[PDB]
PDB file of all heavy atoms in Angstrom:
ATOM      1  N   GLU A  15     135.047  68.526  -4.383  1.00 50.43           N
ATOM      2  CA  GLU A  15     134.168  67.418  -4.876  1.00 50.43           C
ATOM      3  C   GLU A  15     134.224  66.220  -3.914  1.00 50.43           C
ATOM      4  O   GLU A  15     134.537  65.109  -4.303  1.00 50.43           O
ATOM      5  CB  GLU A  15     134.721  67.042  -6.261  1.00 50.43           C
ATOM      6  CG  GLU A  15     136.180  66.572  -6.144  1.00 50.43           C
ATOM      7  CD  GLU A  15     137.100  67.588  -6.824  1.00 50.43           C
ATOM      8  OE1 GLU A  15     137.312  67.460  -8.020  1.00 50.43           O
ATOM      9  OE2 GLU A  15     137.578  68.478  -6.140  1.00 50.43           O
ATOM     10  N   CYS A  16     133.919  66.440  -2.660  1.00 48.69           N
ATOM     11  CA  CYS A  16     133.950  65.322  -1.668  1.00 48.69           C
ATOM     12  C   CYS A  16     132.708  65.365  -0.766  1.00 48.69           C
ATOM     13  O   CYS A  16     131.868  66.238  -0.891  1.00 48.69           O
ATOM     14  CB  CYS A  16     135.229  65.546  -0.852  1.00 48.69           C
ATOM     15  SG  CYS A  16     135.261  67.237  -0.198  1.00 48.69           S
ATOM     16  N   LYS A  17     132.588  64.427   0.143  1.00 52.33           N
ATOM     17  CA  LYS A  17     131.400  64.409   1.056  1.00 52.33           C
ATOM     18  C   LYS A  17     131.727  65.159   2.353  1.00 52.33           C
ATOM     19  O   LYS A  17     132.756  64.941   2.962  1.00 52.33           O
ATOM     20  CB  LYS A  17     131.126  62.927   1.341  1.00 52.33           C
ATOM     21  CG  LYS A  17     130.897  62.170   0.026  1.00 52.33           C
ATOM     22  CD  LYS A  17     129.561  62.594  -0.596  1.00 52.33           C
ATOM     23  CE  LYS A  17     129.759  62.885  -2.088  1.00 52.33           C
ATOM     24  NZ  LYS A  17     128.587  62.263  -2.771  1.00 52.33           N
ATOM     25  N   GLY A  18     130.860  66.047   2.774  1.00 52.46           N
ATOM     26  CA  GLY A  18     131.118  66.821   4.026  1.00 52.46           C
ATOM     27  C   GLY A  18     130.693  66.000   5.245  1.00 52.46           C
ATOM     28  O   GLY A  18     131.509  65.378   5.898  1.00 52.46           O
ATOM     29  N   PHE A  19     129.420  65.995   5.557  1.00 52.61           N
ATOM     30  CA  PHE A  19     128.937  65.216   6.737  1.00 52.61           C
ATOM     31  C   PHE A  19     127.493  64.750   6.509  1.00 52.61           C
ATOM     32  O   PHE A  19     126.632  65.524   6.134  1.00 52.61           O
ATOM     33  CB  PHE A  19     129.014  66.188   7.919  1.00 52.61           C
ATOM     34  CG  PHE A  19     128.454  65.527   9.157  1.00 52.61           C
ATOM     35  CD1 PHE A  19     129.061  64.375   9.672  1.00 52.61           C
ATOM     36  CD2 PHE A  19     127.323  66.063   9.784  1.00 52.61           C
ATOM     37  CE1 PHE A  19     128.537  63.760  10.816  1.00 52.61           C
ATOM     38  CE2 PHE A  19     126.799  65.449  10.928  1.00 52.61           C
ATOM     39  CZ  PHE A  19     127.407  64.297  11.443  1.00 52.61           C
ATOM     40  N   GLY A  20     127.229  63.486   6.731  1.00 49.34           N
ATOM     41  CA  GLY A  20     125.848  62.954   6.527  1.00 49.34           C
ATOM     42  C   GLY A  20     125.581  62.778   5.028  1.00 49.34           C
ATOM     43  O   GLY A  20     124.479  62.988   4.560  1.00 49.34           O
ATOM     44  N   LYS A  21     126.586  62.396   4.275  1.00 50.42           N
ATOM     45  CA  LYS A  21     126.399  62.206   2.803  1.00 50.42           C
ATOM     46  C   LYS A  21     126.843  60.800   2.390  1.00 50.42           C
ATOM     47  O   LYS A  21     127.936  60.370   2.707  1.00 50.42           O
ATOM     48  CB  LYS A  21     127.292  63.264   2.149  1.00 50.42           C
ATOM     49  CG  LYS A  21     126.475  64.075   1.138  1.00 50.42           C
ATOM     50  CD  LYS A  21     126.143  63.202  -0.075  1.00 50.42           C
ATOM     51  CE  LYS A  21     125.472  64.057  -1.155  1.00 50.42           C
ATOM     52  NZ  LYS A  21     124.007  63.827  -0.981  1.00 50.42           N
ATOM     53  N   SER A  22     125.999  60.085   1.684  1.00 50.46           N
ATOM     54  CA  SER A  22     126.353  58.699   1.240  1.00 50.46           C
ATOM     55  C   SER A  22     127.726  58.678   0.552  1.00 50.46           C
ATOM     56  O   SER A  22     127.982  59.433  -0.368  1.00 50.46           O
ATOM     57  CB  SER A  22     125.251  58.301   0.253  1.00 50.46           C
ATOM     58  OG  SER A  22     125.192  59.253  -0.804  1.00 50.46           O
ATOM     59  N   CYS A  23     128.609  57.818   0.999  1.00 49.46           N
ATOM     60  CA  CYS A  23     129.969  57.737   0.383  1.00 49.46           C
ATOM     61  C   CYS A  23     130.484  56.291   0.417  1.00 49.46           C
ATOM     62  O   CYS A  23     129.827  55.402   0.924  1.00 49.46           O
ATOM     63  CB  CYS A  23     130.850  58.650   1.243  1.00 49.46           C
ATOM     64  SG  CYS A  23     131.157  57.872   2.848  1.00 49.46           S
ATOM     65  N   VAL A  24     131.654  56.052  -0.122  1.00 48.15           N
ATOM     66  CA  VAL A  24     132.212  54.663  -0.123  1.00 48.15           C
ATOM     67  C   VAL A  24     133.475  54.596   0.752  1.00 48.15           C
ATOM     68  O   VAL A  24     134.472  55.221   0.445  1.00 48.15           O
ATOM     69  CB  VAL A  24     132.550  54.370  -1.590  1.00 48.15           C
ATOM     70  CG1 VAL A  24     133.247  53.010  -1.701  1.00 48.15           C
ATOM     71  CG2 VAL A  24     131.264  54.348  -2.422  1.00 48.15           C
ATOM     72  N   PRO A  25     133.392  53.829   1.816  1.00 51.20           N
ATOM     73  CA  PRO A  25     134.548  53.675   2.735  1.00 51.20           C
ATOM     74  C   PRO A  25     135.620  52.779   2.101  1.00 51.20           C
ATOM     75  O   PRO A  25     135.319  51.746   1.530  1.00 51.20           O
ATOM     76  CB  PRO A  25     133.941  53.015   3.970  1.00 51.20           C
ATOM     77  CG  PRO A  25     132.720  52.306   3.478  1.00 51.20           C
ATOM     78  CD  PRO A  25     132.228  53.049   2.260  1.00 51.20           C
ATOM     79  N   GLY A  26     136.867  53.170   2.195  1.00 51.03           N
ATOM     80  CA  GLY A  26     137.963  52.349   1.598  1.00 51.03           C
ATOM     81  C   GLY A  26     138.986  53.273   0.933  1.00 51.03           C
ATOM     82  O   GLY A  26     140.151  53.275   1.281  1.00 51.03           O
ATOM     83  N   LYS A  27     138.553  54.065  -0.017  1.00 54.45           N
ATOM     84  CA  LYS A  27     139.494  55.003  -0.707  1.00 54.45           C
ATOM     85  C   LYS A  27     139.411  56.409  -0.089  1.00 54.45           C
ATOM     86  O   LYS A  27     140.065  57.328  -0.546  1.00 54.45           O
ATOM     87  CB  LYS A  27     139.033  55.027  -2.167  1.00 54.45           C
ATOM     88  CG  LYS A  27     139.887  54.062  -2.993  1.00 54.45           C
ATOM     89  CD  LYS A  27     139.098  53.607  -4.223  1.00 54.45           C
ATOM     90  CE  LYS A  27     140.032  52.866  -5.187  1.00 54.45           C
ATOM     91  NZ  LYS A  27     139.732  53.430  -6.534  1.00 54.45           N
ATOM     92  N   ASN A  28     138.613  56.580   0.947  1.00 52.39           N
ATOM     93  CA  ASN A  28     138.475  57.916   1.613  1.00 52.39           C
ATOM     94  C   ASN A  28     137.989  58.969   0.612  1.00 52.39           C
ATOM     95  O   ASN A  28     138.714  59.873   0.236  1.00 52.39           O
ATOM     96  CB  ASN A  28     139.871  58.260   2.151  1.00 52.39           C
ATOM     97  CG  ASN A  28     140.268  57.256   3.235  1.00 52.39           C
ATOM     98  OD1 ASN A  28     140.983  56.309   2.969  1.00 52.39           O
ATOM     99  ND2 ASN A  28     139.831  57.421   4.454  1.00 52.39           N
ATOM    100  N   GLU A  29     136.756  58.859   0.186  1.00 52.86           N
ATOM    101  CA  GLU A  29     136.197  59.851  -0.786  1.00 52.86           C
ATOM    102  C   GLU A  29     135.637  61.078  -0.048  1.00 52.86           C
ATOM    103  O   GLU A  29     135.362  62.097  -0.653  1.00 52.86           O
ATOM    104  CB  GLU A  29     135.078  59.105  -1.517  1.00 52.86           C
ATOM    105  CG  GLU A  29     135.612  58.561  -2.849  1.00 52.86           C
ATOM    106  CD  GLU A  29     135.823  57.043  -2.762  1.00 52.86           C
ATOM    107  OE1 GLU A  29     135.017  56.379  -2.133  1.00 52.86           O
ATOM    108  OE2 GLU A  29     136.789  56.571  -3.336  1.00 52.86           O
ATOM    109  N   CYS A  30     135.470  60.990   1.253  1.00 51.88           N
ATOM    110  CA  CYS A  30     134.932  62.151   2.029  1.00 51.88           C
ATOM    111  C   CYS A  30     135.916  63.328   1.986  1.00 51.88           C
ATOM    112  O   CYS A  30     137.051  63.186   1.567  1.00 51.88           O
ATOM    113  CB  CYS A  30     134.783  61.636   3.463  1.00 51.88           C
ATOM    114  SG  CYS A  30     133.084  61.080   3.730  1.00 51.88           S
ATOM    115  N   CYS A  31     135.488  64.487   2.421  1.00 51.90           N
ATOM    116  CA  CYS A  31     136.395  65.678   2.416  1.00 51.90           C
ATOM    117  C   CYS A  31     137.515  65.489   3.447  1.00 51.90           C
ATOM    118  O   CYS A  31     137.448  64.618   4.296  1.00 51.90           O
ATOM    119  CB  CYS A  31     135.509  66.866   2.802  1.00 51.90           C
ATOM    120  SG  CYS A  31     134.236  67.124   1.538  1.00 51.90           S
ATOM    121  N   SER A  32     138.544  66.298   3.378  1.00 55.49           N
ATOM    122  CA  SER A  32     139.674  66.170   4.354  1.00 55.49           C
ATOM    123  C   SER A  32     139.165  66.381   5.787  1.00 55.49           C
ATOM    124  O   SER A  32     138.592  67.407   6.109  1.00 55.49           O
ATOM    125  CB  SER A  32     140.674  67.262   3.959  1.00 55.49           C
ATOM    126  OG  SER A  32     140.056  68.539   4.072  1.00 55.49           O
ATOM    127  N   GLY A  33     139.361  65.409   6.644  1.00 54.75           N
ATOM    128  CA  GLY A  33     138.884  65.535   8.055  1.00 54.75           C
ATOM    129  C   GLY A  33     137.751  64.534   8.307  1.00 54.75           C
ATOM    130  O   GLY A  33     137.678  63.923   9.357  1.00 54.75           O
ATOM    131  N   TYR A  34     136.866  64.362   7.354  1.00 53.47           N
ATOM    132  CA  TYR A  34     135.735  63.399   7.538  1.00 53.47           C
ATOM    133  C   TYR A  34     136.075  62.052   6.886  1.00 53.47           C
ATOM    134  O   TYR A  34     136.800  61.990   5.910  1.00 53.47           O
ATOM    135  CB  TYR A  34     134.529  64.041   6.838  1.00 53.47           C
ATOM    136  CG  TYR A  34     134.305  65.440   7.369  1.00 53.47           C
ATOM    137  CD1 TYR A  34     134.316  66.529   6.490  1.00 53.47           C
ATOM    138  CD2 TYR A  34     134.087  65.647   8.737  1.00 53.47           C
ATOM    139  CE1 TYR A  34     134.110  67.824   6.976  1.00 53.47           C
ATOM    140  CE2 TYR A  34     133.881  66.943   9.223  1.00 53.47           C
ATOM    141  CZ  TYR A  34     133.892  68.032   8.343  1.00 53.47           C
ATOM    142  OH  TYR A  34     133.691  69.310   8.823  1.00 53.47           O
ATOM    143  N   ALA A  35     135.553  60.975   7.421  1.00 53.69           N
ATOM    144  CA  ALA A  35     135.837  59.626   6.841  1.00 53.69           C
ATOM    145  C   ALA A  35     134.539  58.818   6.710  1.00 53.69           C
ATOM    146  O   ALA A  35     133.591  59.021   7.449  1.00 53.69           O
ATOM    147  CB  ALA A  35     136.789  58.957   7.835  1.00 53.69           C
ATOM    148  N   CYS A  36     134.492  57.903   5.773  1.00 52.06           N
ATOM    149  CA  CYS A  36     133.259  57.076   5.584  1.00 52.06           C
ATOM    150  C   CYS A  36     133.154  56.008   6.682  1.00 52.06           C
ATOM    151  O   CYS A  36     134.138  55.404   7.067  1.00 52.06           O
ATOM    152  CB  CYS A  36     133.426  56.417   4.214  1.00 52.06           C
ATOM    153  SG  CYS A  36     133.162  57.647   2.913  1.00 52.06           S
ATOM    154  N   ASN A  37     131.967  55.773   7.184  1.00 51.88           N
ATOM    155  CA  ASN A  37     131.788  54.745   8.258  1.00 51.88           C
ATOM    156  C   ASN A  37     131.059  53.508   7.709  1.00 51.88           C
ATOM    157  O   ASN A  37     130.701  53.451   6.547  1.00 51.88           O
ATOM    158  CB  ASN A  37     130.962  55.441   9.352  1.00 51.88           C
ATOM    159  CG  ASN A  37     129.533  55.734   8.866  1.00 51.88           C
ATOM    160  OD1 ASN A  37     129.239  55.655   7.688  1.00 51.88           O
ATOM    161  ND2 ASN A  37     128.625  56.077   9.737  1.00 51.88           N
ATOM    162  N   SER A  38     130.842  52.515   8.540  1.00 52.16           N
ATOM    163  CA  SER A  38     130.141  51.277   8.070  1.00 52.16           C
ATOM    164  C   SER A  38     128.731  51.171   8.676  1.00 52.16           C
ATOM    165  O   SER A  38     127.991  50.255   8.367  1.00 52.16           O
ATOM    166  CB  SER A  38     131.016  50.119   8.554  1.00 52.16           C
ATOM    167  OG  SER A  38     132.177  50.035   7.737  1.00 52.16           O
ATOM    168  N   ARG A  39     128.348  52.091   9.533  1.00 50.62           N
ATOM    169  CA  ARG A  39     126.984  52.027  10.147  1.00 50.62           C
ATOM    170  C   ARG A  39     125.952  52.688   9.224  1.00 50.62           C
ATOM    171  O   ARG A  39     124.949  52.093   8.877  1.00 50.62           O
ATOM    172  CB  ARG A  39     127.100  52.794  11.469  1.00 50.62           C
ATOM    173  CG  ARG A  39     126.271  52.086  12.545  1.00 50.62           C
ATOM    174  CD  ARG A  39     126.415  52.828  13.879  1.00 50.62           C
ATOM    175  NE  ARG A  39     126.274  51.773  14.923  1.00 50.62           N
ATOM    176  CZ  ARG A  39     127.308  51.413  15.636  1.00 50.62           C
ATOM    177  NH1 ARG A  39     127.623  52.081  16.714  1.00 50.62           N
ATOM    178  NH2 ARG A  39     128.026  50.384  15.270  1.00 50.62           N
ATOM    179  N   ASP A  40     126.196  53.911   8.822  1.00 55.60           N
ATOM    180  CA  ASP A  40     125.238  54.618   7.916  1.00 55.60           C
ATOM    181  C   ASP A  40     125.791  54.688   6.482  1.00 55.60           C
ATOM    182  O   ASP A  40     125.147  55.217   5.594  1.00 55.60           O
ATOM    183  CB  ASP A  40     125.102  56.025   8.508  1.00 55.60           C
ATOM    184  CG  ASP A  40     123.684  56.552   8.273  1.00 55.60           C
ATOM    185  OD1 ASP A  40     123.410  56.985   7.166  1.00 55.60           O
ATOM    186  OD2 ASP A  40     122.899  56.515   9.205  1.00 55.60           O
ATOM    187  N   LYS A  41     126.976  54.161   6.249  1.00 53.31           N
ATOM    188  CA  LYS A  41     127.578  54.191   4.877  1.00 53.31           C
ATOM    189  C   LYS A  41     127.612  55.626   4.327  1.00 53.31           C
ATOM    190  O   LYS A  41     127.338  55.863   3.164  1.00 53.31           O
ATOM    191  CB  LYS A  41     126.677  53.289   4.021  1.00 53.31           C
ATOM    192  CG  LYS A  41     127.276  51.882   3.952  1.00 53.31           C
ATOM    193  CD  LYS A  41     126.155  50.841   4.025  1.00 53.31           C
ATOM    194  CE  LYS A  41     126.507  49.644   3.135  1.00 53.31           C
ATOM    195  NZ  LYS A  41     125.939  48.458   3.835  1.00 53.31           N
ATOM    196  N   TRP A  42     127.953  56.584   5.156  1.00 52.43           N
ATOM    197  CA  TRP A  42     128.014  58.003   4.685  1.00 52.43           C
ATOM    198  C   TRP A  42     129.237  58.720   5.275  1.00 52.43           C
ATOM    199  O   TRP A  42     130.108  58.102   5.861  1.00 52.43           O
ATOM    200  CB  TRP A  42     126.692  58.653   5.141  1.00 52.43           C
ATOM    201  CG  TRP A  42     126.613  58.808   6.640  1.00 52.43           C
ATOM    202  CD1 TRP A  42     127.546  58.408   7.541  1.00 52.43           C
ATOM    203  CD2 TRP A  42     125.537  59.408   7.417  1.00 52.43           C
ATOM    204  NE1 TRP A  42     127.108  58.730   8.813  1.00 52.43           N
ATOM    205  CE2 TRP A  42     125.874  59.345   8.788  1.00 52.43           C
ATOM    206  CE3 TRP A  42     124.309  59.996   7.062  1.00 52.43           C
ATOM    207  CZ2 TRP A  42     125.023  59.848   9.775  1.00 52.43           C
ATOM    208  CZ3 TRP A  42     123.450  60.501   8.052  1.00 52.43           C
ATOM    209  CH2 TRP A  42     123.808  60.428   9.405  1.00 52.43           C
ATOM    210  N   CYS A  43     129.314  60.016   5.112  1.00 52.89           N
ATOM    211  CA  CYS A  43     130.483  60.770   5.652  1.00 52.89           C
ATOM    212  C   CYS A  43     130.324  61.006   7.158  1.00 52.89           C
ATOM    213  O   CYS A  43     129.300  61.472   7.620  1.00 52.89           O
ATOM    214  CB  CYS A  43     130.488  62.101   4.897  1.00 52.89           C
ATOM    215  SG  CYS A  43     132.196  62.640   4.655  1.00 52.89           S
ATOM    216  N   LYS A  44     131.338  60.685   7.920  1.00 49.06           N
ATOM    217  CA  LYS A  44     131.271  60.882   9.399  1.00 49.06           C
ATOM    218  C   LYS A  44     132.616  61.402   9.920  1.00 49.06           C
ATOM    219  O   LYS A  44     133.663  60.907   9.551  1.00 49.06           O
ATOM    220  CB  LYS A  44     130.971  59.495   9.972  1.00 49.06           C
ATOM    221  CG  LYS A  44     130.799  59.591  11.491  1.00 49.06           C
ATOM    222  CD  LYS A  44     130.259  58.265  12.034  1.00 49.06           C
ATOM    223  CE  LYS A  44     128.789  58.433  12.433  1.00 49.06           C
ATOM    224  NZ  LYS A  44     128.784  58.397  13.924  1.00 49.06           N
ATOM    225  N   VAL A  45     132.592  62.393  10.775  1.00 45.65           N
ATOM    226  CA  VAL A  45     133.872  62.945  11.323  1.00 45.65           C
ATOM    227  C   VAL A  45     134.588  61.887  12.180  1.00 45.65           C
ATOM    228  O   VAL A  45     133.961  61.067  12.826  1.00 45.65           O
ATOM    229  CB  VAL A  45     133.467  64.168  12.164  1.00 45.65           C
ATOM    230  CG1 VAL A  45     132.496  63.755  13.278  1.00 45.65           C
ATOM    231  CG2 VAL A  45     134.718  64.797  12.786  1.00 45.65           C
ATOM    232  N   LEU A  46     135.900  61.900  12.176  1.00 43.71           N
ATOM    233  CA  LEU A  46     136.674  60.896  12.976  1.00 43.71           C
ATOM    234  C   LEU A  46     136.434  61.092  14.477  1.00 43.71           C
ATOM    235  O   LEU A  46     136.101  60.163  15.187  1.00 43.71           O
ATOM    236  CB  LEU A  46     138.146  61.156  12.633  1.00 43.71           C
ATOM    237  CG  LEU A  46     138.841  59.833  12.301  1.00 43.71           C
ATOM    238  CD1 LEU A  46     138.546  59.446  10.850  1.00 43.71           C
ATOM    239  CD2 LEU A  46     140.351  59.992  12.489  1.00 43.71           C
ATOM    240  N   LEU A  47     136.608  62.294  14.960  1.00 45.84           N
ATOM    241  CA  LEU A  47     136.399  62.561  16.419  1.00 45.84           C
ATOM    242  C   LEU A  47     134.944  62.969  16.705  1.00 45.84           C
ATOM    243  O   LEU A  47     134.395  63.400  15.702  1.00 45.84           O
ATOM    244  CB  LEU A  47     137.365  63.705  16.762  1.00 45.84           C
ATOM    245  CG  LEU A  47     136.935  64.991  16.047  1.00 45.84           C
ATOM    246  CD1 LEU A  47     136.559  66.052  17.083  1.00 45.84           C
ATOM    247  CD2 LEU A  47     138.090  65.505  15.183  1.00 45.84           C
TER     248      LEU A  47
END
């Protein structure tokens, strides 16, 4: 139940799936590397 990639999410509590993190440019799931 998390965000994979290119999915609107909330940065701060890390709601994205393991490996992906929320960014502040598109406010969605984005891979770290």
Side-chain angles (χ1 to χ4, degrees):
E15 60 248 272
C16 53
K17 303 290 133 137
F19 176 62
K21 232 289 187 262
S22 57
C23 72
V24 175
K27 263 155 169 226
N28 295 98
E29 263 106 38
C30 264
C31 296
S32 61
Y34 306 122
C36 286
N37 68 346
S38 285
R39 218 178 211 110
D40 213 281
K41 264 141 144 146
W42 69 358
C43 214
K44 183 170 253 251
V45 59
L46 228 82
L47 67 117

